[PDB]
Amino acid sequence: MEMEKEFEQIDKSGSWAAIYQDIRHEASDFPSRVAKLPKNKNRNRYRDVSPFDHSRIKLHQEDNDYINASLIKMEEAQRSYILTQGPLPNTVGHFWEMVWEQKSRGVVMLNRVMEKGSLKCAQYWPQKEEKEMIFEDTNLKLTLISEDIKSYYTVRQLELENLTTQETREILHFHYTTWPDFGVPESPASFLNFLFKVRESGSLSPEHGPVVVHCSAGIGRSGTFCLADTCLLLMDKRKDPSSVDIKKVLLEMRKFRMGLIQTADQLRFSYLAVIEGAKFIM
């Protein structure tokens, strides 16, 4: 079926939970043996969210190459994304090592450091120009260059220096700051505006390594971001845009990381975002 009318048909019939449970039943199951090794317990935020072995990002290190991060490679859309958990106190250095080694231009953050009165990820970037951060375990230096605070999101320019080689690179930090502590946004307008700002920066384009996207677990809000982007790109590429099937695209992405889209409300929000986004594109 088309999307907008499939949408109203699920609303009128109140069957979002049943649609979402079908997706969960059909989703791929692949091994995640490296994630579960005992030496990696303090590298995982949640015991039930792990990268598959076949698609995990490897750190360029011979001691321990593990990080909770997955490469989502979308062949028809010609887009790639790295989805990862919010960094932990003992993985901030690994996080920036990954950004460096994978040649990413941009980092997309969809959570606040504290939500619901608890810490959802480490304070992994500097908040003042004159107070830079040094990650001694991976030999990197990170400096805040500029910050632009808007009503729904903040964009930061950061400098990452590889202290071994003295090479430097400019990284863009795109921080969506207004996702509610509970539920999903009422309108997708600010989320779509944010997606378009990431696109306009070049961070999603083939001349760079894959964008790094995270929330707390790296599957819920993060899944919504890449699902909406890929679906809108496919609607631009194909002769028949009504052929794009958001459930099929989500199942394809779940071949590369488990659990993408965590609730039926996040599924409905993803439909809403693609529907409204397709009208603005034209």
Ligand SMILES: Cn1[nH]c(=O)cc1Nc1ccccc1
């Ligand atoms: C929510 N909404 N409803 C409309 O009719 C338009 C939007 N917002 C929007 C913002 C940026 C890009 C695409 C859509």
Ligand SMILES: Cn1[nH]c(=O)cc1Nc1ccccc1
């Ligand atoms: C909304 N949208 N997004 C694309 O990439 C292309 C379209 N157009 C469209 C044409 C007929 C039916 C539905 C959508």
